Design a binder for these strands. Sequence first.
RNA 1: UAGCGUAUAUUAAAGUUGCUGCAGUUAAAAAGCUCGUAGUUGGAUCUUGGGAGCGGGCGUCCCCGCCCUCUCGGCGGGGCCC
Length: 186
Amino acid sequence: SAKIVKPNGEKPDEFESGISQALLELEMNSDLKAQLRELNITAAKEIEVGGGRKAIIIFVPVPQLKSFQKIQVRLVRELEKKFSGKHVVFIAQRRILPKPTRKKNKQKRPRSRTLTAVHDAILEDLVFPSEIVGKRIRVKLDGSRLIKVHLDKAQQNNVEHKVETFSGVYKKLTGKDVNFEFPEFQ
RNA sequence: UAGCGUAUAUUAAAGUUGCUGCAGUUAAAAAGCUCGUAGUUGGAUCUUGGGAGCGGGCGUCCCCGCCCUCUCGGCGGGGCCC
Ligand SMILES: [Mg+2]
Ligand SMILES: [Mg+2]
Ligand SMILES: [Mg+2]
Ligand SMILES: [Mg+2]
Ligand SMILES: [Mg+2]
């Protein structure tokens, strides 16, 4: 199988040729080759979400992430059309660096490579057509904390059915749980 | 009570020297006012929940083990190892 668009660490292409092939007959399409041949993906997951629903996550290099962000809605529309019954999200590959403890000549860890910043950026990239307008993290009496994220109320018609997939994906690849709301206009 | 009084130094009483812990309108006590160097003090932000068996009951509690590094390992190149 032609796997030309998937750079990796070195090796792993774990039967996820489906996304590469799908992009490959998203070749010869309408007005999408001016902005798709030069940029590619790193990895893809087919995690379980909610009930029997399935969502697929696509990991992208960061400058290539911004270049996906400019054309994401069209590509995700027909790629969901091909992969019927599943939801597609685009996430960067973010490279968290560990916190330096008291244990040769290491460099200063960038603030964007911290886990807090990475989780914030992941939450921002996960919901792309809508914009985050607030955060209402709440400690519920047990030491456990639930995050509540407010979306921009201008893409509610576009994205209101994916919120449980967003919650499942964010629980899967970050570990904490979120809810999504659409407040009245500010 | 075989002891008891007096003088003086000193401690508690004394939160009447105050770190714990005092005061400063009118009782004693805020500089006429502003700048200012030592001194003293100084906003928020970079690892957290799922983690590995013993684990105060995987019992959604958790004795608790976290699922630092590499040049000779010495129990020029075999696993039993440090
Ligand atoms: Mg005294
Ligand atoms: Mg007094
Ligand atoms: Mg007076
Ligand atoms: Mg000074
Ligand atoms: Mg501070």
